[model samples]
Target: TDLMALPLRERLIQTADHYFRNMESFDLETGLTGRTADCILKVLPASFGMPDRTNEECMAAHIATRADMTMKNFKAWRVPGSIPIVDEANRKVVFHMEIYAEMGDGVYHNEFIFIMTTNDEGTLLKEVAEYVDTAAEKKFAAERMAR
Candidate 1:
């Protein structure tokens, strides 16, 4: 999913085309914030695989869980930002992302990720993960749902 190495000319072409065609709607002063927030919150419960709790509990549990998995011996990393599309379907937008995160090891390495969608009521699907095949991926998705 990392298309970060496209030629500069091609990247510029895409940038110009995208800006002229799409930037108006994505402009922050237009107040399209709710859709993006909902998209993020929708996936968060799945991230923890649990019902809502206090913010303190959430943070502590997140660290505990990852430390249990042995990815905790590090500090956060800072990465540059960009305007990137996070999801798409049928050449139409399902999600367009605005990202804010450090680039540390555990789950935040990818700079471009799904954060929001255009269709506000289209089930707001997201990838659970990608391995070698669909069945393995679905199993992971299903288990998280069960959690």
Candidate 2:
């Protein structure tokens, strides 16, 4: 069944898993249409300290840049002690997960807090308020500069 046919919680959970397992689908319509928030156009990359990106620019910022960074062995899983909070009235979901990846010879363990809003059907993610692992990313960048 299509993701839209599933319950909100199910769709959101599956969407999270799908992205990591199918990295190439970052640009595919079916893949992103259901997962990417609708407010993407209004979002400014610089708000996250990233250079500006249009919808076209987003693919590179979100996917290609990681590939360029030589990040490998990417693995993301829900944090053991964390429980997702679902706010049906507000059409929002918040969850915690950890990403393990390798860049050069160093391994990175990054934690993320995801906040997403969905449409009434619960299928379409309307906007992603935040998703980041700032501390880990900062460390990675600092080490790269030192090297």
Candidate 3:
């Protein structure tokens, strides 16, 4: 199937899924493995104690280190339900969803607002705003330390 020919929502879903999967399975030597090489991520400023990263591959390497310190493994991330709003005129899509990931006895469930801009062809992701739920992530981190 041609991903570029799919509806914007479908394309976003596929892109998001691939992006997370690579992050969760990140390798420092080879870096992130997926189609998310060009993605930009704005993670929670205070959650991971790391500044926002412009490249998703760099972000994934840091995330791999984080998982090693805390979680035993990278389980999975899922977006069970999402409502994607499309701005056809601008070739952009805004997504609001609760992303879930399993690590240890806790499942990180956090809300996010993703703003993705496509190229003029509306086929590739040019940039993205990854607005994470800081409160939820803070709570999760606090509880993890308590464990």
Candidate 4:
């Protein structure tokens, strides 16, 4: 169901899923965005368990194309500029924001951004959540818990 009841981690996976779908459409509909899309497509295979494309390659390609966008239709693709994940146990919040953008037909363009957080500590991150990419949070939690 699209009503994702998964926890924060899986919810994050869901977020990436939607991001990939929209991104893929944008790329397919507009060939001019291929440079950026090619970089992005490298990340797609792994997301599908296809195992050919790698996230590292995607990141690397993004690094290469970020400043040198060749698409006449490309207005801008928001770099994962800053990952602001606010974690406050007492206040019971885990707020986050990821900024991104896209270029569409004509001078048409769009910027994408969203927020996700949780207060329920018992939330196993595999249930009761969606659109929250918990990768950074999980890695942070591991470090914080380890210490």
- For candidate 3, the per-residue lDDT at 56 reads 53
Give a tens-digit lDDT track for model 3, residues 1-147: 487788766665565555556656766676544333465655544545646456655655566636643543454433556566777677667777565556666565667777767665555556666777677767765775646
Winner on TM-score (2 vs 4) = 2
Q: Candidates 1 and 4: which is better by lDDT?
A: 4
Off by over 4 Å in 4: 1-7, 16-20, 26-78, 84-105, 116-147
Q: List the residue pairs that clash in candidate 3.
A: none
What tens-digit string does per-residue lDDT give for candidate 2 at 1-147? 586778777776565444445443343354344544334522322335744234445555556546556666667777998987887677777778777777675676777776766666666555665456656566676665645
Candidate No. with top TM-score: 2
- Candidate 1, residue 52: the lDDT equals 37
**Model 1, range 1-147, lDDT digits (tens) per residue?**
122365433343333233223322333234222222322222332444444343234345545534443333223222335343333342122222322223222232222132322332333211111112234334534544434
In candidate 2, the residue pairs with backbone N, CA or C atoms under 3 Å apart (3 or more residues apart, or in different chains) clash, namely 38-126
Residue-wise lDDT of candidate 4 within 48-100, one digit each (tens)? 33233333454454444432433232332333554434333421222233333
Q: What is the C-alpha RMSD of each candidate to the true structure, in Å?
A: 13.2, 4.3, 4.5, 18.1
Q: For each predicted model, how many residue pairs clash, with residues at least 3 apart or on different chains?
A: 1, 1, 0, 7
Runs with alpha carbons beyond 4 Å of true place in candidate 2: 1-5, 16-33, 41-55, 131-133, 143-147
Tell me model 3's lDDT, rounded to 2 decimals: 0.60
* Overall lDDT per candidate, in order of appearance: 0.31, 0.60, 0.60, 0.33
Any runs in candidate 1 off by more than 4 Å, and if so which?
Answer: 1-41, 44-49, 52-54, 73-113, 116-147
